[PDB]
Amino acid sequence: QVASNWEGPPYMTYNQPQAGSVTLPVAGYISSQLNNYAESLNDYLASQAGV
Amino acid sequence: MALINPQFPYAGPVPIPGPAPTETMPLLNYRVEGRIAGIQQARQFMPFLQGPHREVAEQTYYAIGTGIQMGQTFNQPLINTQEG
Numbered sequence: 001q002v003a004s005n006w007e008g009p010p011y012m013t014y015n016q017p018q019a020g021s022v023t024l025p026v027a028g029y030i031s032s033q034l035n036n037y038a039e040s041l042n043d044y045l046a047s048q049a050g051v
Numbered sequence: 052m053a054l055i056n057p058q059f060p061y062a063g064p065v066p067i068p069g070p071a072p073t074e075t076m077p078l079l080n081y082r083v084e085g086r087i088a089g090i091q092q093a094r095q096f097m098p099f100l101q102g103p104h105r106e107v108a109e110q111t112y113y114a115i116g117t118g119i120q121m122g123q124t125f126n127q128p129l130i131n132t133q134e135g
Contacts, residue, residue, distance in 0.1 A: 011122050023135030024128050 005046040014048065 007013045017024055027044070028037030129135070 009120075012120065015125050015127065016123075017125065017128055021128060023131035025131045
């Protein structure tokens with residue numbers, strides 16, 4: 001039982017920045033990445049749902 | 052291992068007065084039957100304990116739990132718009 005997107009309990013880790021993380025980027029930036037934007041939303045929702 | 056004097060030898064022992072011959076003979080002392088007396092108790096209220104002791108004391112532990120873990124309001128970083 002391991003999950004590739006599990007960052008911990010989702011009510012405790014949803015607004016938590018990561019370890020190094022001086023400045024965070026945005027998850028998507030037609031004008032920029034599009035299928036990387038859609039997979040950055042699917043990976044976040046898989047973290048909040050646990051596989 | 053004495054040396055015999057040839058000029059003044061002597062003979063063996065002659066009879067002398069004696070110590071009343073029955074008075075050097077003892078009686079054979081006649082033991083009666085005996086008994087370790089009383090009814091013995093089975094156990095004794097001892098002044099010391101009969102078990103082992105410990106030289107040093109060791110610290111014991113018991114597990115405890117923490118509590119319901121809550122969420123937090125983090126201070127959130129700024130956006131990396133090429134200044135960072």
